[PDB]
């Protein structure tokens, strides 16, 4: 368990710096290519686990179409892994279409959860 606030902060810091970006973008691309999940038919906006209640709030905020598409992709992945095959090289998830559709619905709720956990322990102030 590790919040996406820290991840977003680290990511923005890395991306803003130009030289460090030139150093780390190619290795990131090659890593996500060798990750072994684009081919079998997964977007990275699904691999994140679904035990934390914040994840439940995130999913409950999704629109209908994306939830249905996510269900189709996950069940198809289940079946294809069961078969031991991989999908044909026609529906491999192309790199340019790995859009983040779920990250904002994590951060929007993570901020509220963090400020809830903070505001309880307020002081009398002056």
């Amino acid at each position: 368990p590790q919040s996406f606030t820290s991840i977003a902060r680290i990511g923005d810091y890395i991306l803003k710096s130009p030289v460090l970006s030139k150093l780390c973008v190619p290795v990131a691309n090659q890593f996500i290519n060798l990750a072994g999940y684009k081919k079998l038919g997964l977007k990275f906006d699904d691999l994140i686990a679904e035990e934390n209640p914040i994840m439940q709030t995130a999913l409950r905020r999704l629109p209908e179409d994306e939830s249905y598409a996510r269900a189709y992709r996950i069940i198809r992945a289940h079946q294809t892994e069961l078969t031991h095959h991989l999908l044909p090289r026609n529906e491999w998830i192309k790199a340019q279409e790995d859009v983040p559709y779920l990250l904002p619905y994590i951060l929007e709720a993570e901020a509220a959860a963090k400020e809830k956990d903070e505001l309880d322990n307020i002081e009398v102030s002056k």
Partner: protein, 93 residues
């Protein structure tokens, strides 16, 4: 029974997973299917491609530790071979 806590999985009819629509699963029934539709092509080709795709992940650690173990062994028997007064005493003692 007394009410129990919230759970992310239930029983049949109330799985609780996201509601899906448009999925249309099919079947063929096991009797009229000729089980071993692919038994040699699937076997050899899938086995070799899967062995290729996950080959390094065991070659690298096993090779590293085999090299380590071989070096340790060779130094050990070099210790107890006409070297117990000059090499043994400089590390052991």
């Amino acid at each position: 029974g007394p009410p129990s806590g919230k759970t992310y999985m239930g029983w049949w009819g109330h799985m609780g997973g996201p509601k899906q629509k448009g999925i249309t699963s099919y079947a063929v029934s096991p009797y009229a299917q000729k089980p071993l539709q692919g038994i040699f092509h699937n076997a050899v080709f899938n086995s070799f491609r899967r062995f290729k795709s996950q080959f390094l992940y065991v070659l690298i650690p096993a090779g590293i530790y085999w090299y380590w173990w071989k070096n340790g062994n060779e130094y050990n028997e070099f210790l107890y071979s006409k070297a117990g007064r000059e090499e043994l005493e400089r590390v052991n003692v």
